[PDB]
Amino acid sequence: SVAHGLAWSYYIGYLRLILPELQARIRTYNQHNNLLRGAVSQRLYILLPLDCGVPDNLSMADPNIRFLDKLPQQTADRAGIKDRVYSNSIYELLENGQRAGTCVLEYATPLQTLFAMSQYSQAGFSREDRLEQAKLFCRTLEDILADAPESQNNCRLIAYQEPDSSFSLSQEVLRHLRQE
Amino acid sequence: SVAHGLAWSYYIGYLRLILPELQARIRTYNQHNNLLRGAVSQRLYILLPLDCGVPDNLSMADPNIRFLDKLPQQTADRAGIKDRVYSNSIYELLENGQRAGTCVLEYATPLQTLFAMSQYSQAGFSREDRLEQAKLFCRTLEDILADAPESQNNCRLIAYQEPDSSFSLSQEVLRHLRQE
Ligand SMILES: Cc1sc2ncn3c(SCC(=O)O)nnc3c2c1C
Ligand SMILES: Cc1sc2ncn3c(SCC(=O)O)nnc3c2c1C
């Protein structure tokens, strides 16, 4: 299925390559100017919106999630690209206008592929199937990461479905953060 | 199908985002120290090996394809990653130990997802199906790029299937280059 392949692609072509090196990058940042602040958490927080809406700025999604810093970028030779670069961004989570947590955080971009395929008629992908494909993407990624030696206790899947309109993305992440 | 999704992912999540900006990056490089050399071609050359073997160094694949330079990297905010970086590499193609062409060149990494899925039993993907999925990936990508407004005359798909062992990847690319 589409989402089956997208989840394997997300692991094979991305997470398997950055997760083995994430813990060291995070420690280098925490050991850096950051002297008086709380340490960045050790896991990649991956936002999995089941509506497949992947905006490019998280502060648009919630002004309680504000960008703090970029992690030291990782480079590797990949598929003929010398020094292919992996950047990741650090966000602070605000709770009543005070810092309640700090983590590397991003959206699972393959969900945007499902969104776009549902928009383009040439994809032969129905809007009405997108929700179940997004759930299947998340379930498959969970299945993979449970057994994968790279992704062992250094990412956190945050899946959610917005209503009512009363939704706090920051509270979703904070729920997962403080359970460690 | 798996490869259907992978081809839409490759376009939506990558090619649609770098191709609109490639021509300007290539011109900036050609207008740069490069004063006496031939200009880099205007298209992204995408290697599509139907055996799904995506090595990380092209000089391993053929010593007649040798790395020349990195293009000026492109950055954009993406899915919560500030200044997500797209690097691409420039290769020269040798013919009888003289430069016969110069182009931006890389492998279509989603083919490596098919390769890996055929290797991992949890993917439920048979080795015997990989060849037809790789062909379907290429066919779908061609179908997409024909209609896509981004990818109009700025990439070149190089699909091939090695035997005999007598195969020249450099000659494949040079065939496509000199037809412009
Ligand atoms: C084969 C695949 S899936 C996938 N998903 C997210 N990726 C990222 S983060 C933000 C982005 O998509 O640009 N960087 N590479 C990937 C990537 C790759 C390279
Ligand atoms: C969603 C997808 S597919 C895909 N295919 C190749 N991509 C590249 S080149 C080399 C690489 O894979 O790392 N950079 N991003 C991608 C990419 C992304 C971000």
Side-chain angles (χ1 to χ4, degrees):
Chain A
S1 83
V2 169
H4 182 67
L6 295 177
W8 275 93
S9 167
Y10 190 54
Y11 168 68
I12 295 292
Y14 182 59
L15 291 185
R16 118 196 287 202
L17 299 159
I18 62 157
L19 291 179
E21 309 291 348
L22 197 69
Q23 183 191 139
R25 289 166 70 203
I26 289 172
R27 290 187 191 246
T28 293
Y29 180 90
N30 282 333
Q31 286 182 350
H32 207 317
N33 295 119
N34 313 91
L35 188 52
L36 300 179
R37 295 303 159 86
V40 179
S41 301
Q42 220 69 203
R43 299 175 179 251
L44 176 62
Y45 281 73
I46 297 161
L47 295 175
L48 300 152
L50 301 181
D51 64 15
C52 297
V54 173
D56 285 336
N57 243 33
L58 273 154
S59 302
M60 265 54 258
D62 189 338
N64 270 12
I65 305 177
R66 77 182 171 203
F67 166 84
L68 199 65
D69 240 341
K70 303 195 268 188
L71 254 187
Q73 72 189 22
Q74 167 191 354
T75 57
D77 294 352
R78 175 106 173 111
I81 299 165
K82 304 273 174 186
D83 302 322
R84 137 63 139 153
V85 177
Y86 306 93
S87 13
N88 309 83
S89 283
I90 305 171
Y91 287 83
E92 69 174 310
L93 309 186
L94 269 62
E95 193 179 81
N96 302 314
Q98 296 284 359
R99 186 172 297 165
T102 301
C103 65
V104 189
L105 176 67
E106 63 195 54
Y107 286 97
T109 56
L111 293 173
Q112 183 174 85
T113 293
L114 298 176
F115 178 89
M117 290 177 77
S118 76
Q119 299 274 265
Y120 288 103
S121 43
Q122 185 183 15
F125 190 83
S126 155
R127 202 143 58 174
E128 270 75 11
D129 290 339
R130 193 179 71 209
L131 179 55
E132 283 302 324
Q133 284 303 290
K135 291 179 183 193
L136 178 56
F137 175 86
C138 302
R139 238 150 67 243
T140 309
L141 187 62
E142 286 197 343
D143 292 343
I144 297 161
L145 300 181
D147 286 297
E150 298 90 1
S151 44
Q152 297 294 309
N153 302 11
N154 47 15
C155 72
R156 175 77 74 246
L157 305 193
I158 300 160
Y160 54 101
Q161 172 164 40
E162 304 199 37
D164 170 62
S165 311
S166 147
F167 175 72
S168 169
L169 178 64
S170 49
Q171 288 293 295
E172 288 290 294
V173 188
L174 276 175
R175 196 171 84 268
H176 290 78
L177 263 178
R178 302 151 150 174
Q179 290 168 345
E180 287 280 322
Chain B
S1 83
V2 169
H4 182 67
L6 295 177
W8 275 93
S9 167
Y10 190 54
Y11 168 68
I12 295 292
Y14 182 59
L15 291 185
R16 118 196 287 202
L17 299 159
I18 62 157
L19 291 179
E21 309 291 348
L22 197 69
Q23 183 191 139
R25 289 166 70 203
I26 289 172
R27 290 187 191 246
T28 293
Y29 180 90
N30 282 333
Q31 286 182 350
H32 207 317
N33 295 119
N34 313 91
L35 188 52
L36 300 179
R37 295 303 159 86
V40 179
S41 301
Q42 220 69 203
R43 299 175 179 251
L44 176 62
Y45 281 73
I46 297 161
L47 295 175
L48 300 152
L50 301 181
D51 64 15
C52 297
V54 173
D56 285 336
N57 243 33
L58 273 154
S59 302
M60 265 54 258
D62 189 338
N64 270 12
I65 305 177
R66 77 182 171 203
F67 166 84
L68 199 65
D69 240 341
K70 303 195 268 188
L71 254 187
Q73 72 189 22
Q74 167 191 354
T75 57
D77 294 352
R78 175 106 173 111
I81 299 165
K82 304 273 174 186
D83 302 322
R84 137 63 139 153
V85 177
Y86 306 93
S87 13
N88 309 83
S89 283
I90 305 171
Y91 287 83
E92 69 174 310
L93 309 186
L94 269 62
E95 193 179 81
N96 302 314
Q98 296 284 359
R99 186 172 297 165
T102 301
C103 65
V104 189
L105 176 67
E106 63 195 54
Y107 286 97
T109 56
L111 293 173
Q112 183 174 85
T113 293
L114 298 176
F115 178 89
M117 290 177 77
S118 76
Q119 299 274 265
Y120 288 103
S121 43
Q122 185 183 15
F125 190 83
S126 155
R127 202 143 58 174
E128 270 75 11
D129 290 339
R130 193 179 71 209
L131 179 55
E132 283 302 324
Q133 284 303 290
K135 291 179 183 193
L136 178 56
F137 175 86
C138 302
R139 238 150 67 243
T140 309
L141 187 62
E142 286 197 343
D143 292 343
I144 297 161
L145 300 181
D147 286 297
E150 298 90 1
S151 44
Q152 297 294 309
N153 302 11
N154 47 15
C155 72
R156 175 77 74 246
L157 305 193
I158 300 160
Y160 54 101
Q161 172 164 40
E162 304 199 37
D164 170 62
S165 311
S166 147
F167 175 72
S168 169
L169 178 64
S170 49
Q171 288 293 295
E172 288 290 294
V173 188
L174 276 175
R175 196 171 84 268
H176 290 78
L177 263 178
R178 302 151 150 174
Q179 290 168 345
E180 287 280 322

